[PDB]
């Protein structure tokens, strides 16, 4: 059934980063502060990778836009203790944000390190520093409308990944 697959053409990926925001506008991906991006905790299910091959004065630069490959033999699934991230009969790794107890092992088994983890309460982060907890359950009422009404707004301690936009497949 439906064997959901994707075919990226890196010949034409000019790193416009429009796919990085399109996954944010669609999947309710939370902004992270600069203090926590320098710690390598950016929530970006899809990322473009410059690679700068040779001759550091005049290097050719190539992009491999990296997202969750939805591996059929997904190594990030055999490693979830509570069985949150499982595969699909349609053929794409299902991240279930609610069964995720935040073990965060799945990223360590993920060969591509696509899975991003809601380490702190990443929500309204430029409007509330995530290193607090007095307001981590209080949401900005104006921001609640830009969120997609069919993608889970992840709490803290819940891993996420590029789900092939199940909100559009379902």
């Amino acid at each position: 059934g439906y064997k959901w697959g994707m075919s990226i053409d890196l010949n034409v990926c000019n790193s416009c980063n429009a796919c990085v925001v399109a996954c944010q506008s669609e999947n309710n991906i939370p902004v992270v502060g600069k203090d926590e991006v320098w710690l390598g905790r950016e929530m970006h299910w899809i990322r473009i990778d410059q690679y700068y091959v040779g001759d550091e004065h005049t290097p050719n630069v190539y992009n491999m836009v990296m997202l969750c490959q939805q591996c059929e033999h997904a190594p990030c699934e055999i490693v979830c203790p509570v069985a949150a991230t499982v595969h699909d009969a349609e053929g794409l790794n299902n991240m279930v944000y609610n069964r995720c107890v935040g073990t965060k092992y799945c990223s360590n088994n993920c060969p591509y390190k696509v899975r991003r983890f809601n380490f702190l309460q990443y929500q309204d982060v430029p409007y509330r520093s995530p290193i607090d907890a007095s307001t981590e359950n209080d949401s900005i009422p104006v921001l609640k409308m830009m969120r997609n009404p069919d993608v889970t707004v992840r709490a803290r301690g819940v891993m996420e990944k590029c789900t092939f936009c199940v909100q559009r497949i379902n």
């Binding site: 499982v86 349609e90 299902n94």
Partner: protein
């Protein structure tokens, strides 16, 4: 929810008698609901209970 997704034949009724609240399942709900599964092409218990039906 998984109880009818793993086994829809125990509760699937005719399409026309959906908004008929007086519908009591027949004594042979199975082998009639089993027959409505192929008639509706309701997917199997493997495709219907796999974390993406719900929890998208």
């Amino acid at each position: 929810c998984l109880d009818c997704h793993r086994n829809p034949e125990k509760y699937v009724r005719p399409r026309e008698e959906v908004f008929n609240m007086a519908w009591t399942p027949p004594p042979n709900q199975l082998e009639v609901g089993r027959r409505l599964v192929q008639e509706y092409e309701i997917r199997s218990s493997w495709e219907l209970t796999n974390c993406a039906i719900c929890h998208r």
